[PDB]
Amino acid sequence: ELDQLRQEAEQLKNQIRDARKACADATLSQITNNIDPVGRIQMRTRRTLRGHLAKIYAMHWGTDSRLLVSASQDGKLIIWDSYTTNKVHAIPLRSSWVMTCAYAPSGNYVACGGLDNICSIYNLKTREGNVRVSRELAGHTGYLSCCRFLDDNQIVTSSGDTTCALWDIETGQQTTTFTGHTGDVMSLSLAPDTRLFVSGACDASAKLWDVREGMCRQTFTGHESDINAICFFPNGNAFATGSDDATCRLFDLRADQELMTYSHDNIICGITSVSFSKSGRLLLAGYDDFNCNVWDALKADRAGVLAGHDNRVSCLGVTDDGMAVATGSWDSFLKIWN
Amino acid sequence: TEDQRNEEKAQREANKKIEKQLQKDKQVYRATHRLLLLGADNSGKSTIVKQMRILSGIFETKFQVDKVNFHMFDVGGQRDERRKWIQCFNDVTAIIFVVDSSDYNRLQEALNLFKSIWNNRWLRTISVILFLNKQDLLAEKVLAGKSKIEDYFPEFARYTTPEDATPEPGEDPRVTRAKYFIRDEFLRISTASGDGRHYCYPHFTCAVDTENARRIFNDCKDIILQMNLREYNLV
């Protein structure tokens, strides 16, 4: 029985490999062998947002391209105003070990989580006039890696216990649980239509999930170590992965196959964060050697370098109109580049 | 304009209030020392926590020595894999490593864990305070026992007690020889790498003892002394 199961599994794996081999038709470089190089990209620091005490672990942009939220290991959550570098709110946290933060699209709620395995929601528009805790969500058996808002009443969470979950904030209950990874899940990103989402784990694999039914449709491999960043292309038909083997890759969902790999001989350090631009031509990544690289996705040749951080870069973000790039690092500073 | 200037002045007053609060919080924050506790299940790592009378899955203890506040953490609500959440503890003052020296069939795993911690990229500038617990059990095991440290370590038949060792008032020389052999095993891999950027402090402890917080306090004083020697151009 067990031997039959193993033989059957190997046979279906062979059939899947043959189908993928047949479906492959050409290379991305051959189709992209006529476009012009993007040109040298030069960016400078425009604002230096200072005020934190310890290393910054995450950040998120509000849906106005003006407001911002930052999370630090000192145990604070500061809401900035990028235009005037003015602090709006400073929320203390019960647990200092925070690993993620989010900003609701409406702008009335802010969520956070970390090593306490609990997701906390805070309200920004209160009649009394202070930010106060609104709801604590519990049920995960491992540290929280990422959390994203769908609506004002739903949220998606990923844990280090190899699971993802969908919540209902009003009643504080779980509606669907997604399982199937072997290692810890490190990041997730929602589709533009908020109906599918992808997640990368520490087993050198990524998976696509459908929010409603609660099943896995596609699984992607190709890396040789942990994946620690993921993001969605601005059209919802591809995504990008950064791993601990000092490489980046691009995956597509309608071909179920890897498309392009960015790497260099000198680079021997991993990738911590990955984000795209508005058009989909620039890929921004941060590395353990204290700097960020700007790759041209179509040509896969490095075209920009962002330097100025004195320690490891941990978080990267881009506005919803494409007017700024925010980078945080372990030197307790946040920098805006244009 | 009118409303623009009004909202701007309200914004600056709010910003200055927040900045004052942040200055106070920094004042409070920069005067507390953080420590990370590590060990195994058989080791009595929580036992020393309760031995110190002060005493979600994260156990936090606050104690105080000579008007200096220490905050210790124990992460015990996760899975076995720990190569991802340990990177959070990179700015910690020290790592307290507890070792079960009474048993032998699991000493090699403690050696491997210590060596893995020692050679990390984000933990190569953090000092480790080593506590070899369960000395009293070791005394009984070595004295009248059938198990031999020769079988697990075939290099124990050629090692003599170093001169600098200071025996206890009354103690079998064989007990001292073996108990210092374990320490030499742990210190051999701790001095074969590094450029004097971090040190290892060993101590012998039992299941009922009191002067442990003072040991950690003295080690923290030495660590800060080294950092200040580097900082104040006095090297």
């Epitope: 072997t182 290692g183 520490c202 087993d203 050198a204 040789e224 170590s225 942990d226 601990d244 083997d245 000092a246 021997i268 991993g270 | 076995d80 894999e81 720990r82 190569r83 340990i86 795993e109 491997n112 060596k115 893995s116 911690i117 020692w118 050679n119 990390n120 990229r121």
Partner: nanobody, 126 residues
Framework: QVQLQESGGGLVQPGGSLRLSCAAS????????MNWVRQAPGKGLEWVSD????????SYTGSVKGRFTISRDNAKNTLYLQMNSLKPEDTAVYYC?????????????????????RGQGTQVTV
Amino acid sequence: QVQLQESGGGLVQPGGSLRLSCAASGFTFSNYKMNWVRQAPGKGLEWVSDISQSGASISYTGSVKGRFTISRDNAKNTLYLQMNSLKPEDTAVYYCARCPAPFTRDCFDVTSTTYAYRGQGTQVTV
């Protein structure tokens, strides 16, 4: 897809000889440290021996210090373990394990209950 498969093993008598050969695929073979682990009936996972990238530093556990010898073959992407004087205490399942990260001198999780880059194993009986 990272893949590692063991081969060899079998049945022997006390005081015998064996050669366990581990084949690998899916990654560059000369940037990673390699280890040998085994688990016996009624026991948990335990560590035996390890070898570095080039093949200079070699580490053993004491109980097999004078008997077994490790080797790596970068050209053929293979790992080898050589057996000698098999005392009736080695009957187990043997896994060849990879360090999680390249260009790295420490292996954190190799003996975990669940680990991604670990083989299926082969059974040796003495």
